[PDB]
Amino acid sequence: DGTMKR
Amino acid sequence: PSALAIFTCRPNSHPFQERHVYLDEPIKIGRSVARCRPAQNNATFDCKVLSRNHALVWFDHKTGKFYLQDTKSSNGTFINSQRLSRGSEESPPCEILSGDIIQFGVDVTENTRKVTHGCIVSTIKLFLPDGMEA
């Protein structure tokens, strides 16, 4: 959770 | 003695300090959060494009090989530029050898703040329990 996603 | 993985930072990486990670048990690679912070002897990184539970690295005594496994990361894991699994999918165990280039995540541009967050790109050195380089 909380990942900066491309 | 324990098998040992050394992660060193490559020029196209978000900067990090060299890690000496003993593989007595499998080690979680993932993003820093108040419950786990980066340390010289872990594979936790203050890098926003890494997943909380990004990958696992371990040594298998039966095969004598080191493995990396992507554990449903959002942005991917790569060995020598080859992606281990699709987004949010788990990979099989994938063998790594000393000298391999391992990447966690990809670069992501935050659109509203127009800041690009780099990924982790590492040369890994691997040592068997007997000290020999893998």
Residue numbers in the entry:
A (entry chain C): 376 to 381
B (entry chain A): 2 to 135
From the reporting publication:
To understand how SLAMP FHA recognized phospho-MST2, we obtained crystals of SLMAP FHA bound to the pT378-MST2371-401 peptide (pMST2 hereafter for simplicity) that diffracted to 1.55 Å resolution. We determined the structure of SLMAP FHA–pMST2 by molecular replacement using apo-SLMAP FHA as the search model. In the SLMAP FHA–pMST2 structure, the FHA domain adopts a conformation virtually identical to that of free SLMAP FHA with an RMSD of 0.33 Å for all atoms, indicating that binding of pMST2 does not appreciably alter the conformation of the FHA domain. Only six residues of pMST2 (D376GpTMKR381) have clear electron density, and bind to a surface formed by residues from the β3-β4, β4-β5, β6-β7, and β10-β11 loops of SLMAP FHA. The pT378 residue binds at a highly positively charged pocket, with the phosphate group making favorable electrostatic interactions with side chain or main chain atoms from R32, S52, R53 and S75 of SLMAP. M379 inserts into an adjacent hydrophobic pocket on SLMAP. R381 makes hydrophobic and electrostatic interactions with side chains from V107 and V109, and main chain from D108 of SLMAP, respectively, indicating that a positively charged residue is preferred at this position. D376 forms two hydrogen bonds with R53 of SLMAP. G377 forms a 90˚ turn to allow D376 to make favorite contacts with R53 of SLMAP. Our structure thus suggests that SLMAP FHA prefers binding to a phospho-threonine peptide with a consensus sequence of E/D-G-pT-M-x-R/K. Consistent with this prediction, the pT325-MST2320-329 and pT336-MST2331-340 peptides that do not fully conform to this consensus bind to SLMAP FHA with lower affinities.
